[PDB]
Write a protein that binds this DNA or RNA. Structure first.
Ligand SMILES: [Cl-]
Ligand SMILES: [Mg+2]
Ligand code: NA
Ligand code: NA
Length: 331
DNA sequence: CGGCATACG
DNA sequence: CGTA
DNA sequence: GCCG
């Protein structure tokens, strides 16, 4: 009754097993901090299965037969059901390693490998890093300067104001080009920690060279606090944008992506997420259908041909999957 | 046991 | 290495 | 950590 891949089942944004899923996602995150990608995936998948259930798990009996629940994930759920807390999860939560790796990897420009190296060098706090700035990249310096603002979520209200300023720059850069909101806000989130926009043009080829033109226009409007070509071909830009606030402003992470209209359904699918949904969809494609999926296309390696898609609905049909709207992709 | 998504900056 |  |  519960399929094994997250892309085979609807997963809504809010659900009936929030506490259980949050505990499993702590263990997934801790596995990632140790480089244990397989265990991270299992705990993420187990959490996602709970998100897809139609009602709360109340007894360990109800996990029998669910995919991705074995002895370890079942023991976590059993302790939460019996005692309201899981000793392993709480030990992770309070550990110095978990807390510091979480703080460091939240910095824009810092991943697990960098965070782990700093941890081993004895660093523990953001002010430790600020006192050692020669050990920081341009990107990391921006991430650290803006960390407080970037730690506070954006509202959907804020997103609509940002989309209008992006649309203005895009319209000057290339009349007729369009801007589509992707990411978590397209999945229905009311708030979130960055904003993602996908840009295209209805005439294939007209989007070539577009993103530099858009970024220079936003930069001239004074709206870009950081981007990687500020000193200046590219198709993805990971920026920090000035967002107006009552009497002031705040820094917000914004990603801009350009795709040709022939690739737009694939890019829309990929950039809408969730991350686990897309990993599961690509795994399903390759392992169950023998087709290779990415954010540009869907390749048949036996015929050496790419599928044409005019919509996300086309892509789900190609893969033999029931269509899921973005709000049911919250694996 | 092997496998675990797949790109771009 | 970072980013999504 | 779990699946096939
Ligand atoms: Cl692992
Ligand atoms: Mg996002
Ligand atoms: Na980071
Ligand atoms: Na093994």
């Amino acid at each position: 009754w519960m399929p094994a891949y997250a892309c085979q089942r609807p997963t809504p944004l809010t659900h009936h097993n929030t506490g259980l899923s949050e505990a499993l996602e702590i263990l997934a995150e801790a596995a990632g901090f140790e480089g244990s990608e397989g265990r991270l995936l299992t705990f993420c998948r187990a959490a996602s299965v709970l998100k897809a259930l139609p009602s709360p798990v109340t007894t360990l009996s109800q996990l029998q037969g669910l995919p991705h629940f074995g002895e370890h994930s079942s023991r976590v759920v059993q302790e939460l059901l019996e005692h309201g807390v899981c000793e392993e999860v709480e030990r992770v939560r309070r550990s110095e390693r978990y807390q510091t790796m979480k703080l460091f990897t939240q910095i824009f420009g810092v991943g697990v490998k960098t965070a782990d190296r700093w941890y081993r060098e004895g660093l523990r706090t953001l002010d430790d890093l600020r006192e050692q700035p020669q050990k920081l990249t341009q990107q990391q310096k921006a991430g650290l300067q803006h960390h407080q603002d970037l730690s506070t979520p954006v509202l959907r209200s804020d997103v609509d104001a940002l989309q209008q300023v992006v649309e203005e720059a895009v319209g000057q850069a290339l009349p007729g080009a369009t801007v589509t909101l992707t990411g978590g806000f397209r999945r229905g989130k009311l708030q979130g920690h960055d904003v993602d926009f996908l840009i295209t043009h209805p005439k294939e080829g007209q989007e070539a060279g577009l993103l530099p033109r858009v970024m220079c226009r936003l930069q001239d409007q004074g709206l870009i606090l950081y981007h990687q070509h500020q000193h200046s071909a590219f198709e993805r830009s990971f920026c920090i944008f000035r967002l107006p606030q009552p009497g002031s402003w705040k820094a917000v992470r914004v990603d801009l992506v350009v795709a040709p209209v022939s690739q737009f359904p694939f890019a829309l699918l990929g950039w809408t997420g969730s991350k686990l949904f897309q990993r599961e969809l690509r795994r399903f494609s390759r392992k169950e259908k023998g087709l290779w999926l990415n954010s540009h296309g869907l390749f048949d390696p036996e015929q050496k041909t790419f599928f044409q898609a005019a919509s996300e609905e086309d892509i789900f049909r190609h893969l033999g999957l029931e269509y899921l709207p973005p709000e049911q992709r919250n694996a």
